[PDB]
């Protein structure tokens, strides 16, 4: 059990350690796309880049670029695409991304300001009367509904591509109580949160894959689709015990860097998935 490996590193006090193993191994792959000069201002930081062989291409012929990868899980069966929160400049490619990508849901894991800082532009509309149009990519976005709870905050968006006027719906989920320092005591909130996204559909196969993101998306990004994807796992397979979450880490790793940003989101992540696996195995 995934847990006593758990207890095993609490008691040998070996987090760190535990996590910067994990930076060693982990893949390193060539993200020259994004180090274009005519993409620096398409990066919000010079540190966190899409990887080439698994970034999101848009469909334009002038820049394609968008910081977003492709997480593709094989034997889970789930997709993840992980961008950062968009910029002043990148509203319209994310929107742009998720029409093309036919994604049913956008899952944003930061607030947009964060210790006194811009963490994000405002890239949907906070007034069903004020909606937002982007016009370099010809989309138009209205706020439909908005349901607020203590520890998130579910929209319904309404996207509309002004080019044929077909619209779709996207669901926004919005945590909006991760820490601004360090993890929660409990993943309480957070699983709660993760078994909403999923009771969307926005997880489901017939849609695009979801779009996570955080201010880098990687931290608390990866956090949350390597949790999904350890449960998906666990209850799939003939024998769950065999889900070790480090090679889920790493096989993830191999789509977008950095995934999971300190020793701190590691132990939360296993927490996480261990008291998620009580759900999952029958209760």
Known sequence: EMEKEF??????????????????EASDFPCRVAKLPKNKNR???????????????????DNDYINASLIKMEEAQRSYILTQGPLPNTCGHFWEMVWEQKSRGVVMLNRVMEKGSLKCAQYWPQKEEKEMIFEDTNLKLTLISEDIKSYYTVRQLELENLTTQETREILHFHY???P???????????LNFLF???E?????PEHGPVVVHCSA????????????????????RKDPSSVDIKKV???????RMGLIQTADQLRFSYLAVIEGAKFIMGD
Not at 13 to 19: H, N, R, T
């Open 196 to 198: 909403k996204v999923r």
């Open 217 to 236: 998306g990687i931290g608390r990004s990866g956090t949350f689709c390597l949790a999904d994807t350890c449960l998906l796992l666990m209850d799939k």
């Open 7 to 24: 207890e095993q590193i609490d008691k040998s006090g070996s987090w760190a350690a535990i996590y910067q193993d994990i930076r060693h």
């Open 176 to 178: 909006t109580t991760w």
């Open 200 to 204: 969307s559909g926005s997880l489901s």
């Open 180 to 190: 601004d320092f360090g993890v929660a005591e409990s993943p309480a909130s957070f």
């Open 249 to 255: 880490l790493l096989e993830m790793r191999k789509f």
């Open 43 to 61: 990066n919000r930081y010079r540190d966190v880049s899409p990887f080439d062989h698994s970034r999101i291409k848009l469909h334009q012929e």
